[PDB]
Design a protein around this ligand. Structure first.
Ligand SMILES: CCCCCCCC/C=C\CCCCCCCC(=O)O[C@H](COC(=O)CCCCCCCCCCCCCCC)COP(=O)(O)OCCN
Ligand SMILES: CCCCCCCC/C=C\CCCCCCCC(=O)O[C@H](COC(=O)CCCCCCCCCCCCCCC)COP(=O)(O)OCCN
Ligand SMILES: CCCCCCCC/C=C\CCCCCCCC(=O)O
Ligand SMILES: CCCCCCCCCCCCCCCC(=O)O
Lengths: 334, 635, 244, 334, 244
């Protein structure tokens, strides 16, 4: 940094050294002034000037070293407090730029929130005509067309429910609630939601509830079971699903055994990945595939472990490993 | 961790905080080197005067080392005391005392010896300038040379090594005895003691303003008066610091009610309480600064008037006692191409009485009022006045006499002849001398009498007190020209140094008083610097004791600008009081006895005081900066 | 008199952010003795700080006396803080080199109100908190109860808009606390001056009119008292606290 | 700002003056050095120092002044080219910040169109089953149930097309074109689309067309036609809507007139506002109200003047003033 | 741990002799927070001197961890206090030239142990107290509360048994004092270590589990708490001090 200081003040260090040389020249030809008696003046002046530069360098090249050290990585307040006017001007420039950047970020966030709110308004505004649709529909007498319109209405309902689950999982973190739930009403509601579609696919239900109580949240687990059941049913055709739930030790375990095509053992660990589509059957393209990803990401707050034992050509055994009730003592109490 | 890095960080922290200590060390070493070099320089033998020459430089060196030693010892006893917490902590952690001594004494032998090495190397550069400054004042034409004088190197190393040994001895005792592991309404007494200080200060001033007056007129009744004045003023100062500051400040505070600004709460909450704690320090500072200013002013006053007093002591440019010497000097001048206006005037010496004309007291006798010796001259010799019979006119001013001998208007003057006495009267007082001081005794003026009475006085010729030479042969010179050849002719005329010249009695006085003024000025500068540093080193502790007060005051909304604005006035009051009291002391010391020295005051004294104040205000300016650094970090 | 609109503040160390305000909005009219309380780990103290000008707000709007300070320069912000907004701290904050009169006349010295007016105003204030008998007493001679009344008398001297009290009755017995709150409530009654107070002593909060139960940055309703007996509201706040 | 420059170098002028004082003192003391010559040299050097000081100030106080102009000015490139090494540091710091801000803005906007594209993909996925819903609806027999289902289909279908258009208006600027259009077949097809509406509500139509050709984009004025038709249809009941399209001057005017309730005169200027909904009847709350705002937004680029003449209790007359044909020559030429 | 029996401090300066200590018995056990508080002029600092071996002990039989302190020379007593006791001062003693980490680690840098376990101990203590983010700073850019917390942590790092402590709250405001007392009480539960505070304000001693009152010597009149709520207990402490 010595080079920078000796190059910045290039003219002031010569505006002085010109005068000693001028004196030592005027005191070489004029006979009234001596030489060995002006070398003394020169020597004393040089000593003072050298000491003055040494004491000036340290005080002057400090703010810029701080600026260089801060740069743009971190410690935005690392710059030293200004003392001289020019440093004050630089400091005002820096503060103005940072403030403007903060304003832009805040405005971007507000615009995004407004867009999300408008999307909320629209999705409610299109949910309500679906309720009107259901109430108008539930009046005919036919069977085949009734069932047809019924399950296409149901698939519209499930895709809309999926988008609603996405919007609510955007902020799920602030809606935790732990209490006892009854699995039988939830399973009955899920079956009722699939009554027409299960009848169309001709798949029965065999419910065996050895366990009684579970300790989790209602809606997210309900939708997880919903999508698992849909996947299991669309993996099967005219087959009976063995739904056995037993209290293995201190934890609740729900096993959904099916006799359908199942999942290939290579793809058994890869069912929860992003955007998985089955190319074996063209009817599997209707599946979004994001439901499994959101289910697995929403299972972490619920602490529910999903165990899958599927064989291709045999069926899929979807097993839910509910966490131990004692493990919730550190969560409910705290 | 490792000891060494701890020592090094401590040394950097010390070097930043105490920079006035290092500056004072470098300055003092430089001055000692310069004086010892100048003592041995052979050109110091050109200074010709009554004083021995290079025997005054030795006295200056001896006096200088005492001030430097006192400053150093006191500074280090201030410094050690601010490390009691660290000593206690190191003793509590478990490490012994002979392990703390080697930490806190191995970072002073670096600072001290580095500054000592800088001082010698920067005292070689300034010696020629010091010598030339000396030669300019005493008016000598010689050559100054640059040489090292390896005696002064030895004589500085030895002195400062001795002082450092003393510092180490003084630190060991404090460390040893501090092993304990130990981590407001005014009274009646402080009212009487407060009034007695003001009463005792002014008694000295009043007795001083008389001195050489109608009383104390005895050789042995003077030392009592001087002792009384000095003792009174010193004791009055000491008791003025311990109680009269509290009295006045208490009155000022309990005459405002409760409505106080921030300037007054910052000032009067510390001037009342901590100024009294330092009363054996401000006393010394004030009295010694008074000595410095007063002595320098008197020495300077006795320097301008050298030419006037030389022109008055000898009336003519040369004064002669023998006819043959005068005639041979004139013969030498004849081929000197210089025309000299020779004049002669006989002098008759007698005794008179003018005790009636004295307006003072009979105690102002200075000899017998009726039998005091005077010199009588004719009227024809004087070319400026023409008196008549029965009238006497005094000649000359002699400013000393006007302050001791009081003269009234016309009265009766009796001439004590052998068998007669012609009465005369005093017409007026002249201002131009006519006779060299050898004839006219000490300072008695010369009378003017009519020539008609002179024809009887020269017929009487009372042969009782007549001088050996009743003649004033005195040779003049032509207009202002080259007079040095005439002077050297004069000194080769006389070999028994019994002839007076105007140019040589105006050089001895100049040389002597120039030397005294040089020495006194340098000692005054040294004392100024050391006192400023000591007064700076106590405001540090005073500031660090009010750190909590700043914090509390800053939660009520007061911003740093107001705090610093109050601190400015506080520092003004803290640093101005000793200076003002010292200035008053010096002014009343100079005015008492200036007429004994010269005939010019208020030209030198003003500039001396201005120089002192201007160089003293720097240390007051440099303390507001430390107060700012303390204020900022007390959020 | 006070208007706040969705003021944000997040406590972070530039790497981990710990949000503590979660959608507050408070409206205050002139001359109400409001009280804020609730929990221990919540942000009620940070709330009291952010309503004043001591803590800068992340995102929001503050309107005091119609004037706005969210976008306000630092120098003029300190100025506005100085000419309004009396404070009462937890600690005494008295100077021990000044008497009582000097202590509670010191801040008024900048405005330069001569002598007669300032002395009259001090008499008027200090006759009403019962400290006029201690005009010339240093702080270290009087009991700990009286020093808090001295601090309050200092805060009520220039007639500001809002008094931001921060738990004054924290280190007092029953008698001193009861006297201090009786005098404070009477002073509030006589002169129109809103007082905002954060307290943990329910008997202390009993003297108030409106109570805001800040719970983890949420309103959780707010009691309103009304024209009922002190003990009835005291038992009501007992049962409300027992709910928590 | 000369005061600022002088307070900058208040430490170098002091050094120069101390040099002058020392050089005079050491000359006065000496008996070899003559005083007059040194005094004259000092006089002639203090004069040149003033000129040097002026030149240095004039050169020196420009870079900081320029950036101080920039600290609130609209332009950003106002800063001068740094020369000395004590200006390169400031330039580099400011360059770093001004690059970082632009990077942040680019990233935020990129995320924005990413989420918007995902939304559009989901929206089309929702669209397809509604085409399935139409095929099923067209495959019905019973008159009343089919009419009700077609009514509701039209409601949801116009809502979804409104959403399509209001998200396409976000990048309308990238989808601009000009084509020639036949109006009668499009009008007849749109009328046949709303057959269930008029069958249920008994709304008549009077056709009086004198102009047939317009000059604008196909899709954009086509959706303008749908939005105006739906507005008139939902704001009229059991009334013969008299559509009058005549070449009034050189501008085509699609003056639609209905015998319905109309719009209150106080609310006539506010119809084009964002989110405006009619409060006279509760049946208008179901309408989003975005249609008029988006129509105004998309009509300004196409220079179509929507002259509204609405009378309450009689009907609303919308005058669609088409742009002049000759005004499109500049657009076509460029 | 301390079973004091007839604790007397010798006096007899010049002619006047004051019986500040006339035989005091203290019975404590591990896992306590006993604190003694008296009045000005009762020589509470002299109680520290007699119990902490700051000065020479005169009378009283006290055993520390089952070991009597009256049966060794000065050096043995010094090593015992340096390896078995800990102290906290009213005014924090932090060297300005060091770092926070070096300040807390300095007492362990003389016995020459392995660096790894020392760093582990510092990490644990700093994480527990809450100054770990202030690991590479100097004591001149942190507030008084953080300095006092550092001084408190300095006495918890050399594995002591009894933490003697003067009033660690004289030079602190309300919030910092409350935080320090909270942290000390929290740390007392994690590891067994007896603290015997010697304070003057009842607020600090209201956090304790036993209070001992002395007015000129043998007076006892000790309180017990037991099952109070720290508020009723605080009022009881201060009223009993007032009546005495
Ligand atoms: C007879 C011969 C006469 C010769 C007299 C010449 C002696 C003067 C010379 C040198 C002084 C030696 C002691 C000072 C050097 C130590 C100062 C130092 O190094 O501290 C540094 C800063 O220095 C200072 O703070 C002081 C700045 C002024 C330098 C000293 C000024 C010397 C003259 C002033 C004394 C005035 C009294 C004169 C009265 C007639 C480090 O501080 P920092 O806060 O960490 O800032 C770092 C920058 N980022
Ligand atoms: C207690 C007061 C402290 C003040 C300390 C200031 C410096 C102390 C030094 C020396 C005292 C000088 C005596 C005061 C003025 C003397 C007046 C005088 O001598 O008259 C004339 C003045 O000329 C001089 O003697 C020069 C006096 C300059 C004194 C030196 C002042 C600066 C001293 C600092 C040098 C040492 C520090 C080194 C740091 C760079 C001489 O006769 P002339 O009328 O010019 O005719 C000659 C032929 N035409
Ligand atoms: C008695 C003479 C005193 C002057 C001594 C001259 C020798 C050079 C001394 C060092 C000068 C250092 C001053 C630099 C600090 C800042 C300068 C300023 O602010 O003016
Ligand atoms: C005869 C000339 C006297 C000159 C007096 C002034 C000397 C220079 C003063 C500035 C040096 C100290 C100022 C900065 C110190 C600091 O901030 O630490």
């Amino acid at each position: 940094m010595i080079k920078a200081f000796l190059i910045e003040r290039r003219s002031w260090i010569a505006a002085f050294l010109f005068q000693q040389a001028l004196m030592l020249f005027i005191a070489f030809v004029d006979p009234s002034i001596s030489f060995g008696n002006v070398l003394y003046m020169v020597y004393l002046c040089i000593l003072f000037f050298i000491i003055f530069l040494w004491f000036r360098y340290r005080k002057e090249t400090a703010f810029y070293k701080s600026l260089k050290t801060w740069e743009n990585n971190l410690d935005v307040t690392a710059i030293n407090e200004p003392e001289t006017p020019f440093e004050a001007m630089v400091e005002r420039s820096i503060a103005g730029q940072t403030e403007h950047l903060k304003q832009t970020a805040a405005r971007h966030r507000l615009a995004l929130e407004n867009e999300k709110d408008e999307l909320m308004a629209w999705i409610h505004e299109v949910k309500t005509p679906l309720t009107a649709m259901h109430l108008i529909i539930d009046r005919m007498e036919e069977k085949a067309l009734k069932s047809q319109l019924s399950y296409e209405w149901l698939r519209i309902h499930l895709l809309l429910d999926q988008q609603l689950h996405q919007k609510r999982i955007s902020f799920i973190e602030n809606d935790l609630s732990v209490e006892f739930i009854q699995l039988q009403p939830l399973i009955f509601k899920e079956i009722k939601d699939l009554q027409s579609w299960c009848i169309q696919k001709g798949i029965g239900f065999d419910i065996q509830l050895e366990a009684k109580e579970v300790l989790s949240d209602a809606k997210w687990l309900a939708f997880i079971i919903r999508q698992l059941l849909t996947n299991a049913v669309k993996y099967s055709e005219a087959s009976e699903i063995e739904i056995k739930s037993f209290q293995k030790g201190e934890q609740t375990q729900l096993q959904v055994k099916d006799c359908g095509r199942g999942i290939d053992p290579k793809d058994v660990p890869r069912i929860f990945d992003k955007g998985f589509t089955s190319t074996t059957d063209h009817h599997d393209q209707a599946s979004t595939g994001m439901g499994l990803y959101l289910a697995k990401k929403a299972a972490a707050p619920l602490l529910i472990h999903i165990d899958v034992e599927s064989e291709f050509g045999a069926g899929t055994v979807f097993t839910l490993t509910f966490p131990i009730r004692n493990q919730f003592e550190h969560v409910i109490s705290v | 961790m490792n000891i060494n890095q701890l020592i090094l960080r401590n040394l950097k922290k010390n070097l930043r905080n105490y920079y006035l200590y290092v500056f004072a060390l470098i300055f003092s070493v430089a001055l000692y080197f310069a004086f010892v070099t100048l003592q041995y320089d052979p050109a110091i033998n050109e200074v010709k005067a009554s004083i021995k020459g290079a025997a005054a430089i030795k006295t200056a060196s001896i006096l200088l080392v005492a001030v430097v030693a006192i400053f150093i010892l006191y500074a280090n006893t201030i410094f050690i005391k601010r490390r009691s917490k660290e000593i206690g902590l190191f003793q509590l952690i478990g490490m012994t005392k002979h392990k703390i001594f080697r930490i806190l004494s191995a970072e002073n032998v670096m600072l001290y010896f580095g500054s000592l090495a800088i001082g010698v190397a920067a005292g070689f550069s300034i010696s020629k300038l010091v010598l030339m400054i000396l030669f300019k004042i005493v008016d000598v034409k010689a050559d100054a040379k640059l040489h090292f004088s390896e005696q002064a190197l030895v004589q500085t190393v030895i002195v400062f090594c001795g002082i450092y040994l003393l510092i180490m001895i003084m630190n060991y005792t404090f460390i040893k005895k501090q092993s304990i592991l130990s981590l407001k309404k005014i009274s009646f007494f402080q009212m009487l003691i407060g009034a007695l200080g003001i009463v005792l200060i002014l008694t000295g001033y009043y007795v001083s303003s008389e001195l050489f007056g109608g009383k104390f007129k005895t050789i042995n009744e003077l030392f009592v008066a001087m002792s009384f004045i000095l003792g009174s003023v010193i004791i009055g100062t000491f008791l003025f610091y311990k109680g009269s500051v509290t009295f006045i400040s208490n009155i000022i505070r309990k005459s405002k009610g409760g409505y106080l600004n921030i300037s007054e709460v910052l000032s009067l909450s510390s001037i009342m309480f901590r100024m009294k704690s330092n009363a054996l320090l401000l006393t010394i500072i004030t009295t010694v600064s008074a000595l410095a200013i007063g002595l320098l002013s008197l020495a300077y006053i006795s320097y301008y008037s050298s030419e006037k007093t030389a022109e008055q002591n000898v009336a003519a440019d040369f004064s002669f006692m023998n006819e043959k010497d005068a005639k041979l000097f004139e013969n030498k001048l004849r081929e000197s191409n210089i025309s000299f206006v020779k004049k002669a005037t006989p002098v008759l010496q007698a005794n008179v009485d003018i005790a009636n004309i004295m307006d003072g007291t009979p105690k102002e006798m200075q000899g017998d009022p009726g039998n005091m010796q005077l010199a009588v001259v004719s009227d024809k010799d004087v070319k400026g006045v023409d008196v008549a019979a029965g009238e006497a006119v005094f000649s000359g001013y002699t400013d000393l006499l006007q302050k001791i001998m009081v003269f009234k208007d016309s009265g009766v003057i009796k001439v004590k002849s052998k068998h007669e006495t012609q009465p005369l009267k005093y017409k007026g007082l002249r201002e131009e001398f006519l006779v060299s001081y050898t004839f006219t005794s000490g300072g008695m003026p010369a009378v003017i009498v009519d020539d008609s009475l002179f024809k009887q006085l020269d017929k009487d010729k009372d042969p009782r007190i007549q001088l050996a030479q009743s003649t004033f042969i005195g040779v003049n010179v032509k207009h202002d020209d080259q007079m040095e050849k005439a002077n050297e002719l004069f000194q080769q005329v006389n070999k028994k140094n019994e002839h007076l010249s105007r140019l040589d009695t105006s050089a001895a006085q100049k040389s002597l008083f120039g030397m005294v003024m040089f020495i006194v000025g340098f000692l005054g500068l040294t004392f100024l610097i050391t006192s400023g540093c000591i007064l700076y080193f106590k405001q540090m502790g005073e500031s660090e004791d009010e750190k909590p007060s700043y914090t509390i005051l800053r939660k009520l909304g007061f911003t740093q600008g107001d705090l610093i604005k109050g601190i400015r006035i506080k520092q003004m009051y803290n640093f101005g009081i000793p200076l003002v009291v010292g200035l008053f002391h010096s002014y009343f010391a100079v005015q008492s006895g200036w007429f004994l020295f010269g005939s010019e005051v208020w030209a030198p004294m003003i500039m001396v005081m201005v120089l002192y104040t201007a160089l003293y205000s720097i240390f007051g300016f440099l303390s507001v900066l430390y107060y700012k650094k303390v204020i900022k970090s007390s959020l | 008199i006070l208007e706040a609109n969705k003021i944000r503040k997040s406590y972070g160390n530039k790497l981990n952010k710990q949000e503590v305000l979660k959608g507050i909005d408070i409206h205050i009219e002139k001359g109400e003795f409001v009280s804020i309380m609730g929990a221990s780990g919540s942000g009620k103290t940070t709330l009291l700080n952010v309503l004043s000008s001591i803590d800068q707000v992340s995102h929001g709007t503050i309107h005091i006396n119609g004037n706005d300070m969210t976008a306000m320069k630092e120098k003029q912000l300190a100025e506005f803080r100085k000419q309004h907004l009396g404070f009462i701290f937890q600690d005494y904050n008295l100077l021990d080199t000044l008497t009582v009169k000097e202590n509670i006349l010191l801040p008024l010295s900048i405005t330069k109100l001569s002598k007669k007016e300032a002395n009259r105003k001090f008499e008027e204030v200090a006759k009403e908190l019962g400290i006029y008998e201690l005009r010339d007493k240093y702080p270290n001679e009087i009991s700990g109860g009286q020093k808090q009344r001295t601090s309050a008398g200092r805060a009520f001297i220039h007639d500001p808009s809002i008094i931001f009290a921060d738990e004054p009755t924290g280190a007092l017995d029953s008698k001193s606390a009861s006297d201090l709150l009786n005098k404070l409530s009477q002073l509030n009654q006589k002169r129109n001056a809103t007082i905002i107070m954060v307290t943990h002593d329910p008997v202390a909060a009993s003297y108030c009119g409106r109570v805001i139960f800040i719970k983890d940055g949420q309103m959780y309703t707010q009691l309103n008292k009304g024209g009922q007996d002190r003990q009835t509201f005291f038992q009501d706040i007992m049962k409300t606290q027992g709910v928590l």
